[PDB]
Nucleic acid binder design. Structure first.
Length: 65
DNA sequence: ATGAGACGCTGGCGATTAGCTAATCGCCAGCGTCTCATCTTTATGCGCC
Protein backbone atom coordinates (compact mmCIF):
# COMPACT_ATOMS: atom_id res chain seq x y z
CA UNK A 1 0.00 0.00 0.00
CA UNK A 2 2.73 2.37 -1.09
CA UNK A 3 5.15 1.26 1.64
CA UNK A 4 7.55 -0.84 -0.46
CA UNK A 5 10.23 0.24 -2.89
CA UNK A 6 9.78 -3.03 -4.79
CA UNK A 7 6.04 -2.89 -5.47
CA UNK A 8 4.31 -1.57 -8.57
CA UNK A 9 0.82 -3.05 -8.19
CA UNK A 10 -2.06 -0.59 -8.43
CA UNK A 11 -5.03 -0.88 -6.08
CA UNK A 12 -8.47 -0.42 -7.65
CA UNK A 13 -9.85 0.04 -4.10
CA UNK A 14 -7.95 0.45 -0.81
CA UNK A 15 -8.82 -2.65 1.24
CA UNK A 16 -6.56 -5.33 2.68
CA UNK A 17 -6.22 -7.67 -0.31
CA UNK A 18 -7.65 -11.12 0.45
CA UNK A 19 -7.89 -14.23 -1.86
CA UNK A 20 -11.55 -13.51 -2.63
CA UNK A 21 -11.52 -9.84 -3.51
CA UNK A 22 -8.05 -10.18 -5.08
CA UNK A 23 -9.52 -9.97 -8.56
CA UNK A 24 -11.25 -6.68 -7.76
CA UNK A 25 -8.81 -4.79 -5.54
CA UNK A 26 -5.84 -5.57 -7.82
CA UNK A 27 -5.75 -4.06 -11.31
CA UNK A 28 -4.02 -7.05 -12.92
CA UNK A 29 -3.72 -5.17 -16.24
CA UNK A 30 -2.01 -2.09 -14.86
CA UNK A 31 0.09 -4.23 -12.53
CA UNK A 32 1.52 -6.33 -15.37
CA UNK A 33 1.89 -3.20 -17.53
CA UNK A 34 3.80 -1.33 -14.82
CA UNK A 35 5.77 -4.51 -14.18
CA UNK A 36 7.13 -4.69 -17.72
CA UNK A 37 7.48 -0.93 -18.41
CA UNK A 38 9.67 -0.45 -15.34
CA UNK A 39 12.23 -2.88 -16.76
CA UNK A 40 12.34 -1.81 -20.41
CA UNK A 41 14.90 0.81 -21.36
CA UNK A 42 14.46 4.15 -23.11
CA UNK A 43 15.86 5.39 -26.41
CA UNK A 44 19.38 6.79 -26.05
CA UNK A 45 18.66 9.47 -28.65
CA UNK A 46 15.20 10.30 -27.27
CA UNK A 47 15.52 9.94 -23.44
CA UNK A 48 11.96 10.47 -22.29
CA UNK A 49 10.57 8.24 -25.08
CA UNK A 50 10.10 4.49 -24.79
CA UNK A 51 11.11 1.78 -27.28
CA UNK A 52 9.09 -0.32 -29.77
CA UNK A 53 8.86 -4.12 -29.36
CA UNK A 54 11.26 -6.50 -31.09
CA UNK A 55 8.55 -7.80 -33.46
CA UNK A 56 7.48 -4.44 -34.89
CA UNK A 57 7.00 -4.52 -38.68
CA UNK A 58 8.21 -0.93 -38.92
CA UNK A 59 11.32 -1.91 -36.99
CA UNK A 60 12.02 -4.90 -39.24
CA UNK A 61 11.54 -2.62 -42.28
CA UNK A 62 14.02 -0.23 -40.61
CA UNK A 63 16.78 -2.80 -40.10
CA UNK A 64 16.15 -4.33 -43.55
CA UNK A 65 16.38 -0.95 -45.29
C1' DA B 1 51.75 29.73 101.94
C1' DT B 2 52.50 22.79 96.13
C1' DG B 3 52.22 19.09 93.94
C1' DA B 4 52.98 18.07 87.21
C1' DG B 5 56.46 16.98 84.24
C1' DA B 6 59.34 11.34 81.61
C1' DC B 7 53.81 6.08 77.79
C1' DG B 8 54.29 -1.48 73.66
C1' DC B 9 57.82 -7.05 69.02
C1' DT B 10 57.87 -6.25 64.74
C1' DG B 11 59.45 -8.17 61.03
C1' DG B 12 59.86 -12.14 59.05
C1' DC B 13 58.28 -16.06 58.30
C1' DG B 14 54.33 -19.56 57.07
C1' DA B 15 50.12 -20.13 55.87
C1' DT B 16 46.16 -19.08 54.94
C1' DT B 17 42.65 -16.84 52.05
C1' DA B 18 41.67 -14.90 47.52
C1' DG B 19 41.51 -14.64 42.61
C1' DC B 20 42.76 -14.17 37.32
C1' DT B 21 44.18 -13.56 32.18
C1' DA B 22 46.47 -15.59 28.73
C1' DA B 23 48.60 -18.71 24.95
C1' DT B 24 47.30 -22.88 21.60
C1' DC B 25 44.70 -24.99 18.95
C1' DG B 26 40.73 -26.83 16.85
C1' DC B 27 36.00 -26.35 14.72
C1' DC B 28 33.30 -24.81 12.12
C1' DA B 29 30.51 -22.02 10.01
C1' DG B 30 21.91 -22.42 6.90
C1' DC B 31 20.92 -24.28 2.58
C1' DG B 32 17.66 -26.83 -1.09
C1' DT B 33 14.92 -26.01 -5.32
C1' DC B 34 11.64 -24.16 -9.09
C1' DT B 35 8.61 -20.82 -11.78
C1' DC B 36 7.92 -16.30 -14.12
C1' DA B 37 9.31 -12.28 -16.58
C1' DT B 38 12.95 -8.43 -17.04
C1' DC B 39 16.89 -6.05 -19.05
C1' DT B 40 21.86 -5.67 -20.24
C1' DT B 41 26.78 -7.29 -21.98
C1' DT B 42 30.28 -10.23 -24.47
C1' DA B 43 32.84 -13.83 -29.03
C1' DT B 44 32.26 -13.77 -34.38
C1' DG B 45 30.22 -11.88 -38.72
C1' DC B 46 29.10 -5.09 -42.38
C1' DG B 47 30.08 0.70 -43.48
C1' DC B 48 34.99 6.65 -44.38
C1' DC B 49 33.93 11.34 -42.90
Amino acid sequence: RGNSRFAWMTRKSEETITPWNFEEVVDKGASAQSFIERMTNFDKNLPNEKVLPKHSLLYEYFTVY
